[PDB]
Specification:
Arc Repressor Mutant, subunit A, 4 helices, rsgi, gene regulation, two-stranded antiparallel sheet, RIKEN Structural Genomics/Proteomics Initiative, Structural Genomics, winged helix-turn-helix, about 55% helix
Length: about 80
């Protein structure tokens, strides 16, 4: 839906994946807690439903994410080689 394409879930997740990637690309490949990610992505408000979704679905089944010590890291595709 148009009202969904804006960023009702996908936009938020896309910005998170992008941020995590770029950060992991720079050097900070280390894991980050949920809230730590929200801050930089500017999604601290987000919504309990959205945060929950990210915590159990997105940052759990997304191939570009790696769950470590409860926190969430970025999973490299195949290494830049």
């Amino acid at each position: 839906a148009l009202s969904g394409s804006s960023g009702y879930k996908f936009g938020v997740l896309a910005k998170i994946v992008n941020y995590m990637k770029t950060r992991h690309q720079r050097g900070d490949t280390h894991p980050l807690t949920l809230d730590e990610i929200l801050d930089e992505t500017q999604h601290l408000d987000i919504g309990l439903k959205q945060k929950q979704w990210l915590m159990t679905e997105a940052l759990v089944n997304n191939p570009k994410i790696e769950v470590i010590d409860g926190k969430y890291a970025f999973k490299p595709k195949y290494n830049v080689r």
